[PDB]
Design a protein around this motif. Sequence first.
Motif, PDB file in Angstrom:
ATOM      1  N   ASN A 110      41.821 143.756   7.568  1.00 38.14           N
ATOM      2  CA  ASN A 110      41.398 143.109   8.800  1.00 38.14           C
ATOM      3  C   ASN A 110      42.457 142.101   9.217  1.00 38.14           C
ATOM      4  N   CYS A 111      42.390 141.687  10.482  1.00 34.48           N
ATOM      5  CA  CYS A 111      43.367 140.763  11.044  1.00 34.48           C
ATOM      6  C   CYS A 111      42.919 139.312  10.961  1.00 34.48           C
ATOM      7  N   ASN A 112      41.847 139.025  10.217  1.00 35.86           N
ATOM      8  CA  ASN A 112      41.253 137.697  10.132  1.00 35.86           C
ATOM      9  C   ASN A 112      41.665 136.942   8.868  1.00 35.86           C
TER      10      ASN A 112
ATOM     11  N   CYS B 271      48.609 137.183   9.644  1.00 27.69           N
ATOM     12  CA  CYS B 271      47.384 137.104  10.433  1.00 27.69           C
ATOM     13  C   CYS B 271      47.373 135.863  11.303  1.00 27.69           C
TER      14      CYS B 271
ATOM     15  N   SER C  30      44.744 139.727  15.915  1.00 24.15           N
ATOM     16  CA  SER C  30      44.367 141.104  16.201  1.00 24.15           C
ATOM     17  C   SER C  30      45.430 141.869  16.969  1.00 24.15           C
TER      18      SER C  30
ATOM     19  N   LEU D 212      46.672 145.143  15.208  1.00 23.63           N
ATOM     20  CA  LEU D 212      45.969 146.415  15.079  1.00 23.63           C
ATOM     21  C   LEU D 212      46.911 147.580  15.357  1.00 23.63           C
TER      22      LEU D 212
ATOM     23  N   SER E   3      41.289 146.735  11.733  1.00 20.34           N
ATOM     24  CA  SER E   3      40.064 146.127  12.221  1.00 20.34           C
ATOM     25  C   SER E   3      40.322 144.651  12.453  1.00 20.34           C
ATOM     26  N   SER E   4      39.695 144.085  13.487  1.00 14.98           N
ATOM     27  CA  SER E   4      39.879 142.659  13.747  1.00 14.98           C
ATOM     28  C   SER E   4      39.208 141.815  12.677  1.00 14.98           C
TER      29      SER E   4
END
Length: 166
Positions: A25-27, A53, A58, A61, A83-84
Amino acid sequence: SNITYVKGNILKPKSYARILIHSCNCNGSWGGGIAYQLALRYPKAEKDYVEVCEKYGSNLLGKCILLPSYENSDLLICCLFTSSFGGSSHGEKQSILNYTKLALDKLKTFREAIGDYLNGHIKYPIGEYKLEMPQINSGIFGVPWKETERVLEEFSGDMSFTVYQL
Ligand SMILES: Nc1ncnc2c1ncn2[C@@H]1O[C@H](COP(=O)(O)OP(=O)(O)OC[C@H]2O[C@@H](O)[C@H](O)[C@@H]2O)[C@@H](O)[C@H]1O
């Protein structure tokens, strides 16, 4: 044709150079599943992932980044940003599949020549690293493995993968 299945733990040490590919994920959260295990074992790689990140969010992606494990000059980590958010908040499985495709295509392009963090910590030519992965997308992201498999098999002729099944 380009997939080799192995049953076993992908984090058991190996004597050969490899790139461990996993879905991210991008978080900035290596919060569960295989990512949690990478965070425990490769905290400097986690730091690089968190910095990427923080910089791009995001916007990542469909991209991938190659990171040193730092603890093992035979192991690089390839983060596929699909995924965000992680956990229950992950994207729609169609989105994850399409970003997996797009990210693997950037890895393909790099090997034929993403690597900013490798400078100074890559031991071998990039083509010497075997590509290995768990059954990405199939755990916390919920995507049936057979769908990701079709994405992997589209790269037949350019990349070969060793997929670890637990
Ligand atoms: N050492 C391990 N070795 C081999 N396979 C493993 C291992 N750990 C987990 N697996 C298997 O890898 C598959 C995918 O693992 P997940 O962590 O759930 O990855 P994914 O479904 O792609 O979701 C990614 C999301 O979860 C975190 O990993 C990441 O932060 C991201 O937000 C699952 O079948 C899981 O059982």
